[PDB]
C-alpha cells in the first residue's frame, strides 16, 4: 500500500529505472529496482544490511572496477538485471 505508493492520487515513474542484482561469495544474490540517476549506494548498503555483511568486510565491483557510494549506475552505463560482484575485503582483527 503506502510502502509502494504514496497517498497521492496521480503519480508515476516512467523514468529510466533499472534492476541491479548483486552476487556475493556465498552465491547469494539480491535484486533491486532503482533509477539510473539514483545512487546505487542505497542498494549496496541495503545488500550488506540484509545479508549480514559490513562495508569494511566486503566490496562491490562492476565492469571490473570497484564501486563506491559516490558512484551512480548511469556512469557505468549498466543495464537492468545486470550482476554486481561482491568480494570479502575482510583484513584486520
Curated annotation (Swiss-Prot):
UniProt GO MF annotations: protein tag activity; RNA binding; SUMO transferase activity; ubiquitin protein ligase binding; ubiquitin-like protein ligase binding
Cellular compartments annotated: Nucleus; Nucleus, PML body
UniProt keyword rRNA processing present: no
Cross-link Glycyl lysine isopeptide (Lys-Gly) (interchain with G-Cter in SUMO1): where in chain: 11
Post-translational changes noted in the entry: Polymeric chains can be formed through Lys-11 cross-linking. Polymeric SUMO2 chains undergo 'Lys-6'-, 'Lys-11'-, 'Lys-48'- and 'Lys-63'-linked polyubiquitination by RNF4.
SUPFAM superfamilies in the record: Ubiquitin-like
CDD domains reported in the protein's UniProt record: Ubl_SUMO2_3_4
Expression by tissue: Broadly expressed.
Pfam family, one: Rad60-SLD
GO CC terms in record: GABA-ergic synapse; glutamatergic synapse; hippocampal mossy fiber to CA3 synapse; nucleoplasm; nucleus; PML body; postsynaptic cytosol; presynaptic cytosol
Residue intervals of the Ubiquitin-like domain: 16-93
Main localization, broad class: nucleus
Key words of the record: Acetylation, Host-virus interaction, Isopeptide bond, Nucleus, Ubl conjugation, Ubl conjugation pathway
Cross-link (Glycyl lysine isopeptide (Lys-Gly) (interchain with G-Cter in ubiquitin)): 11
PROSITE patterns: UBIQUITIN_2
Record cross-link Peptide (Met-Gly) (interchain with G-Cter in ubiquitin), residues: 1
Crosslink site: Glycyl lysine isopeptide (Lys-Gly) (interchain with G-Cter in SUMO): 11
Listed result of changing residue 42 to E: Significantly impairs sumoylation of MTA1
Modified-residue entries (N6-acetyllysine), positions: 11
Cross-link Glycyl lysine isopeptide (Lys-Gly) (interchain with G-Cter in SUMO2) per UniProt, renumbered positions: 5, 7, 11, 21
Free-text function comment from the UniProt entry: Ubiquitin-like protein that can be covalently attached to proteins as a monomer or as a lysine-linked polymer. Covalent attachment via an isopeptide bond to its substrates requires prior activation by the E1 complex SAE1-SAE2 and linkage to the E2 enzyme UBE2I, and can be promoted by an E3 ligase such as PIAS1-4, RANBP2, CBX4 or ZNF451. This post-translational modification on lysine residues of proteins plays a crucial role in a number of cellular processes such as nuclear transport, DNA replication and repair, mitosis and signal transduction.
Quaternary structure annotation from Swiss-Prot or TrEMBL: Interacts with SAE2 and UBE2I. Interacts with ZNF451. Identified in a complex with ZNF451 and UBE2I/UBC9, where one ZNF451 interacts with one UBE2I/UBC9 and two SUMO2 chains, one bound to the UBE2I/UBC9 active site and the other to another region of the same UBE2I/UBC9 molecule. Covalently attached to a number of proteins. Interacts with PELP1. Interacts with USP25; the interaction sumoylates USP25. Interacts with SIMC1, CASP8AP2, RNF111 and SOBP (via SIM domains). Interacts with MTA1. Interacts with HINT1. (Microbial infection) Interacts with Epstein-barr virus BGLF4.
Family: Belongs to the ubiquitin family. SUMO subfamily.
Descriptive protein name: Small ubiquitin-related modifier 2
Amino acid at each position: 500500500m503506502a510502502d509502494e505508493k504514496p497517498k497521492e492520487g496521480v503519480k508515476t515513474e516512467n523514468n529510466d529505472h533499472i534492476n541491479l542484482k548483486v552476487a556475493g561469495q556465498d552465491g547469494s544474490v539480491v535484486q533491486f529496482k532503482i533509477k539510473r540517476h539514483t545512487p546505487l549506494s542505497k542498494l549496496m548498503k541495503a545488500y550488506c544490511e540484509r545479508q549480514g555483511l559490513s562495508m569494511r568486510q566486503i566490496r562491490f565491483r562492476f565492469d571490473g572496477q570497484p564501486i563506491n557510494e559516490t558512484d551512480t549506475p548511469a556512469q557505468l552505463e549498466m543495464e537492468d538485471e545486470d550482476t554486481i560482484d561482491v568480494f570479502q575485503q575482510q583484513t584486520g582483527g
